[PDB]
């Protein structure tokens, strides 16, 4: 299957006193491996997976230096963006940045990305060609001109096709016991009767990794979306994920309905029946 390395940065201005909140998180696939929090005691990039603790002091010094550089750019950006949008010093505003690379099953480069948002809206994004920019509005267009003049796309393309995929491959190897392991969903059905004429069947998928999963209902072997509820996939808190899908059925007709579970960890999809 495909793999990804992604970094997520959140920047929140705190008008009244002092510096903005800065939070950085790094993931391989659906596994957090590093964090930085401006408000934490260490003022260091910190490990959040055992396989990254394999990295020497030089790694933690380098990642701490780079994440502090990211933090200072975001601090300046909050000021720049307040200027571009003619906003007062009084309001809290949010910057978000996400960048990273996807590799296929062969661990070769598939795609790179670098997306930036201001107050929860698209600002500027690197296009799939890693050579050009999507600017949402005229403030972002000013940034696009600046980044074109400074050859930012060329710098990011070199990282995304190079260091990003090289270090993703290193992490996948070092963390192979967990990162290269698929955890198939543990599945069961439950039954809930609201009235004498209506019952709800719930199809559960527990303790799976990675998070990507498809739960579908059929009635007499045909797909049914009517009278179904699918919850957002949610973290168990132990690194695995959970999901359920529910269908409302006439009391006594439970046997017509089947739940279908697709997951990377399953050689063939599972079928459950009440």
């Amino acid at each position: 299957g495909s793999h990804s390395m992604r970094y997520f940065f959140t920047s929140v201005s705190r008008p009244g006193r002092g510096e903005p909140r800065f939070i950085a998180v790094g993931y391989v696939d659906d596994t957090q491996f590093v964090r930085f929090d401006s408000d934490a005691a260490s003022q260091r990039m910190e490990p959040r997976a055992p396989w990254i603790e394999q990295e020497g002091p030089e790694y933690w010094d380098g990642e701490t230096r780079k994440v502090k550089a990211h933090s200072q750019t975001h601090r300046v950006d909050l000021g720049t963006l307040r200027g571009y949008y003619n906003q007062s010093e009084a309001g809290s505003h949010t910057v978000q940045r996400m960048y990273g690379c996807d590799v296929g099953s062969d661990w070769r480069f598939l795609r790179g990305y670098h997306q930036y948002a201001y107050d929860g809206k698209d600002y500027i994004a690197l296009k799939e060609d890693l050579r050009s920019w999507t600017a949402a509005d005229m403030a972002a267009q000013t940034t696009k001109h600046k980044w074109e003049a400074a050859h930012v796309a060329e710098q990011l393309r070199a990282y995304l096709e190079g260091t990003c995929v090289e270090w993703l491959r290193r992490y996948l190897e070092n963390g192979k016991e967990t990162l290269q392991r698929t955890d198939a969903p543990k599945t069961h059905m439950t039954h809930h009767a609201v009235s004498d004429h209506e019952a709800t069947l719930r199809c559960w998928a527990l303790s799976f990794y990675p998070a990507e999963i498809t739960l579908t209902w059929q009635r007499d072997g045909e797909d049914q979306t009517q009278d179904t509820e699918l919850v957002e996939t949610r973290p168990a808190g132990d690194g695995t994920f959970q999901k359920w899908a529910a269908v409302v059925v006439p009391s006594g007709q439970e046997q017509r309905y089947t739940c279908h579970v697709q997951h990377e960890g399953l050689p063939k999809p599972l079928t459950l029946r009440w």
Partner: peptide, 9 residues
């Protein structure tokens, strides 16, 4: 590993 630099908007 993080990218080395971040150019301001």
């Amino acid at each position: 590993k993080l990218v080395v630099g971040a150019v301001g908007v």
